[PDB]
Write a protein that binds this ligand. Structure first.
Ligand code: HEM
Length: 396
């Protein structure tokens, strides 16, 4: 029952570089009870083959009615979304927006996305001494603008979102996380209400109309659950991809020039950014419905389980030379977007924003470099999301 390892005792060492610790675990076995820096005791499933199994395994439920851990009031407010569901609710819910996030549909957004990215890079090259934080001026503002537009979040109300979403990455403390969720959940509900009767053409309006017309298709809870899900999962992961990506790029200068000289490598590069430093370090909560034997180790019904995608991707048997960042490696079968029914619905939009951004910095900042001695970067210690506090850069 008790943890064999406390991760928060491992300090910034672990946050900077968690891989050898996961790697240490994988040697020993596939699953390990641990305590997270914020002190919840969870299970970690490690290693590609087993990691992949667990993601698609329906013995593992994403529905909290199956978790022995009780939800707080703020959280219960928001747990009615597809990602925290099993069939059929999951089915009814995903189907409501699937059309929306296909590759083809998204391609009709390339122009606007491009327009946004031009705006921010232009602004960014105007930093007097050729220095600034990539996170602050590109990686955060791009995804939030794009997704806000898709969903009808008015510009004045966007700033608050960096603040709130931060508050449930690493919270300073569990009290600040909770406040965020209520503050946000509160704001989303006004926003949803403000849509009623306004003939918006954005997806939130559309959902409100869908919901109001027939509350058996979408309940008022699920409506809020969706707005949230599509927003957070829209902001946070994309932001960190871009920021993890550029960083992998900037810290291996050979791979940078390679893509700089040949922009056919862009998609590959973005795939290796997801393979190598993907923003989803551990997939979201999983609750075995009955006890599950993973090679001798018996995880009990209703425990919290995390699949460590970060470790999946550093498994040498599935990825030769797992520590080398190689923009041309075969990246197929990576788990960065998950695997199975819950497979990420907005991968195409993610790839799109990232591709455009990575190209824009490379074609518009010659001589771009890390501004900062790499070991002076600071990583959030949360074991779910892989993320930088800041990412200073420079140019000629
Ligand atoms: C690089 C960016 C992204 C990464 C790495 C990523 C990764 C993931 C992963 C791993 C899952 C499944 C998690 C699990 O099984 O617990 C997932 C699901 C999901 N993602 Fe993303 N995602 C990204 C971008 C986005 C964006 C931009 C959106 C905005 C629409 C989005 C919306 C969702 C939703 C709604 C689900 C739940 C799908 C379902 O339960 O059927 N994601 N994503």
């Amino acid at each position: 029952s008790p943890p064999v390892l406390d991760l928060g005792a491992l300090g910034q060492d672990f946050a900077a570089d968690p891989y050898p610790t996961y790697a240490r675990l994988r040697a020993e076995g596939p699953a390990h009870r641990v305590r997270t820096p914020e002190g919840n005791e969870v299970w970690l499933v490690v290693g590609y083959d087993r990691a992949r199994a667990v993601l698609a395994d329906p013995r593992f439920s994403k529905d909290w009615r199956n978790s022995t851990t009780p939800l707080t009031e703020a959280e219960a407010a928001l747990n009615h979304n597809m990602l925290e569901s099993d069939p059929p609710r999951h089915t009814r819910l995903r189907k409501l927006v699937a059309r929306e996030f296909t590759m083809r549909r998204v391609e009709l957004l390339r122009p606007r996305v491009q327009e946004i990215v031009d705006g921010l890079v232009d602004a960014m090259l105007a930093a007097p001494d050729g220095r600034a934080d990539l996170m602050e001026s590109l990686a955060w503002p791009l995804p939030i603008t794009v997704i806000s537009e898709l969903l009808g979040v008015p510009e004045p109300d966007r700033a608050a979102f960096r603040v709130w979403t931060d508050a449930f990455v690493f919270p300073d403390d569990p009290a600040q996380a909770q406040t965020a969720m209520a503050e946000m959940s509160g704001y989303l509900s006004r926003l949803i209400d403000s849509k009623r009767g306004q003939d918006g053409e954005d997806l939130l309006s559309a959902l409100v109309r869908t919901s109001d017309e027939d509350g058996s298709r979408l309940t008022s809870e699920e409506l809020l659950g969706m707005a949230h899900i599509l927003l957070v999962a829209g902001h946070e992961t994309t932001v960190n991809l871009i920021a993890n990506g550029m960083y992998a790029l900037l810290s291996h200068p050979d791979q940078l020039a390679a893509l700089r000289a040949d922009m056919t490598l862009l998609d590959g590069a973005v795939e290796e950014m997801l393979r190598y430093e993907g923003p989803v370090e551990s997939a979201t909560y999983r609750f075995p419905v009955e006890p599950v034997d993973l090679d001798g180790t018996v995880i009990p019904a209703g425990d919290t389980v995390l699949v460590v995608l970060a470790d999946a991707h550093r498994t040498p048997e599935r990825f030769p030379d797992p520590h080398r960042f190689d923009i041309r490696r075969d990246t197929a079968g990576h788990l960065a977007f998950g695997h199975g029914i819950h497979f990420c619905i907005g991968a195409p939009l993610a790839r799109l924003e990232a591709r455009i951004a990575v190209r824009a910095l490379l074609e518009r900042c010659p001589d771009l470099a890390l501004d900062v001695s790499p070991g002076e970067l600071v990583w959030y210690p949360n074991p779910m999301i892989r993320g930088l506090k800041a990412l200073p850069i420079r140019w000629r």
